Amino acid sequence: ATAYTLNLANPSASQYSSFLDQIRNNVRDTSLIYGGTDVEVIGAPSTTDKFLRLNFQGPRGTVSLGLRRENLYVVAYLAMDNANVNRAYYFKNQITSAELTALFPEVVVANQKQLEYGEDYQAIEKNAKITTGDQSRKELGLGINLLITMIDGVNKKVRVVKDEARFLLIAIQMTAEAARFRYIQNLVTKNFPNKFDSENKVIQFQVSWSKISTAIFGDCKNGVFNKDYDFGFGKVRQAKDLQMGLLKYLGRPK
Numbered sequence: 001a002t003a004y005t006l007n008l009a010n011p012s013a014s015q016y017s018s019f020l021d022q023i024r025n026n027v028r029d030t031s032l033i034y035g036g037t038d039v040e041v042i043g044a045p046s047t048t049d050k051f052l053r054l055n056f057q058g059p060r061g062t063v064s065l066g067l068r069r070e071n072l073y074v075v076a077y078l079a080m081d082n083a084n085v086n087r088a089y090y091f092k093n094q095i096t097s098a099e100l101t102a103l104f105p106e107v108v109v110a111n112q113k114q115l116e117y118g119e120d121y122q123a124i125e126k127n128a129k130i131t132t133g134d135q136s137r138k139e140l141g142l143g144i145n146l147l148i149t150m151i152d153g154v155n156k157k158v159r160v161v162k163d164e165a166r167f168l169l170i171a172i173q174m175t176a177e178a179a180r181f182r183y184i185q186n187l188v189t190k191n192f193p194n195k196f197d198s199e200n201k202v203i204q205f206q207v208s209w210s211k212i213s214t215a216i217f218g219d220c221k222n223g224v225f226n227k228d229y230d231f232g233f234g235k236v237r238q239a240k241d242l243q244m245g246l247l248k249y250l251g252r253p254k
């Protein structure tokens with residue numbers, strides 16, 4: 001599979017942004033124009049190139065993420081354990097052993113482990129054991145320095161579910177979600193490279209990806225919605241106000 005690398009040993013805002021653009025440009029179908037907007041749209045599912053590999057390169061090791069090109073869903077991750085042995089962890093309904101072998105060649109079949117929980121935020125959040133506030137991912141914050149800290153929890157260490165879950169929550173939001181929502185990307189670069197507080201608006205965007213995509217796809221003309229929409233953070237009339245980075249594939253426009 002194709003692989004893009006984020007250098008966390010020497011991070012820069014420009015590098016992070018280009019990294020997100022590489023993801024967007026890889027999965028998009030440039031012939032697709034939704035609601036007369038210039039926002040990138042994910043192309044139809046491929047039977048050949050199903051996965052994308054993302055490498056988080058740090059000073060003491062590299063941790064990798066596997067994403068489904070069809071929808072940017074995280075399907076697995078790779079990290080060396082305390083014995084420097086490469087191990088791959090995957091979500092059952094998301095990928096097979098043969099595909100995992102092709103995605104992460106450095107991991108032998110015996111070292112492929114199926115995760116006990118679901119790939120949805122709810123399942124992951126419960127295993128992250130967040131003890132404050134609403135106990136959701138919002139409570140962890142966001143940021144480059146936070147991502148680095150989370151990677152330290154899985155890189156070259158014995159697997160601890162709590163640490164693995166927290167890493168996944170941050171890794172998914174800093175890649176897949178940031179690719180989908182420019183608002184999230186802009187928050188990261190505006191605060192680069194510091195850890196900062198997340199917002200309700202961040203969560204609201206995330207849970208409304210499909211709704212936003214459907215709205216632009218079938219109820220938007222030349223960037224203007226046919227009616228007022230509210231995804232949780234106020235009324236929106238123009239698609240531009242949503243600062244979208246990537247829209248969900250819903251077919252070709254009619």
Ligand SMILES: Nc1ncnc2[nH]cnc12
Pocket residue numbers: 072073074075119120121172176177
């Ligand atoms: N595993 C996942 N990857 C990306 N976006 C998601 N939204 C919910 N679960 C997700």
